[PDB]
């Protein structure tokens with residue numbers, strides 16, 4: 195195949211992490227700006243690639259969640275106002291670096307801090323039929339009126355558990371496939387939204403643990419791609435990493451065909467035979 199075992203190992207490593215000075219600087223500065231307005235009425239935490247340790251690009255943007263939750267976690271008002279107040283708190287400090295986006299407020303970085311997406315949100319509680327329990331996550335609204343929900347804590351914990359059980363290969367395989375995704379996008383071979391990082395993470399999550407072969411990145415990656423590809427042809431019922439909801443739920447526009455096509459492009463790019 196086209197890339198050596200060592201090249202796959204190199205691609206499997208995290209590139210940006212929460213240890214990075216520029217990441218710490220962004221979190222510190224943004225946290226101070228938000229606390230100046232909201233005090234203890236919010237919980238601030240990370241989600242996305244810095245939280246799950248799946249970054250494969252230098253100087254990656256960080257996703258900082260600001261959960262307005264005074265009603266649920268009190269000190270021992272609609273979403274439009276929350277997001278506007280969040281934007282104001284950030285603009286007072288970061289001025290022209292602040293840009294409102296559809297699902298977040300972006301705070302553009304500089305020589306000393308990474309860019310950050312600040313995600314104002316509320317507590318969400320929803321019943322999971324998969325687990326027959328009420329689950330707690332977050333909810334917010336996009337500027338184009340979609341209700342966006344997430345379970346970042348359960349996503350974090352389940353992904354960490356799987357990597358701990360697979361010789362650390364679960365997240366290493368996610369990272370490799372994210373690298374291939376960016377390369378295919380840069381080459382114009384796939385659209386930049388054929389698959390997202392979240393989608394890749396969920397696809398690999400559903401590959402059984404016994405497909406991850408200690409110390410064999412080439413064969414593990416082969417197993418991962420073949421398993422997802424075949425599962426997509428076979429109409430498989432994949433879960434999200436959070437194990438609370440189905441990946442191919444009728445709430446989500448992404449499809450098994452998207453995953454099948456992505457796996458094919460990865461297989462061809464990597465040169466497996």
Ligand SMILES: [Mg+2]
Nearest residue numbers: 242243255257
């Ligand atoms: Mg992200």
